[PDB]
């Protein structure tokens, strides 16, 4: 009972329901966690992640489910994960949850999403390279590490 769910963008009152309530659960990966792997499978692309989607449940716990309201943001990591999974499995998570927590401003977080872009050419070619110049506009932009991460895990 918990796995692919034709959202591509809307799911269960899990937004509104789970983040409201998680000011008593704090366990962000628990509800929408089991939920991006449910995209990782479901990438429907043609790569298919693991360890990056696993990642961003981490994020979960720190997704912006913080506030414990903004269901809108909720779907919003659910439902580009869903969506926005059928081009880079891996890296299309890993940059997504970061605009969902970070989210401090919008084209930040995006601008990992652009060279993203290039992975869109390759879902599993590029990426993980600017991700440092990118922090440290990030870190900043936002309020992070000034520079310091570059993924390549």
Do not use: H, W
């Not at 000011?23 to 692309?45: E, H, L, P």
């Not at 961003?56 to 969506?83: C, H, P, Q, Y």
């Not at 499995?89 to 970070?102: N, R, V, W």
């Not at 995006?110 to 870190?139: M, P, T, Y």
Request: proline fraction near 1%.
């Amino acid at each position: 009972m918990s796995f692919f769910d034709k959202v591509k963008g809307a799911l269960t009152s899990g937004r509104e329901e789970l983040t409201r309530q998680v000011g008593r659960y704090k366990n962000k990966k628990f509800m929408q966690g089991t939920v991006a792997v449910c995209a990782r499978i479901a990438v429907a692309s043609d790569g298919v992640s693991s360890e990056e989607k696993q990642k961003m449940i981490g994020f979960l716990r720190s997704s912006e489910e913080l506030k414990v309201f903004d269901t809108a943001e909720v779907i919003e990591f659910f439902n580009k994960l869903v969506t926005s999974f059928d081009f880079d499995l891996e890296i299309g998570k890993g940059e997504t949850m970061k605009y969902i927590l970070a989210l401090k401003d919008q084209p930040e977080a995006a601008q990992l999403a652009l060279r993203v872009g290039i992975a869109v050419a390759k879902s599993d070619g590029n990426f993980d390279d600017d991700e440092k110049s990118a922090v440290r506009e990030i870190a900043r932009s936002l309020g992070f590490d000034p520079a310091e991460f570059g993924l390549l895990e």
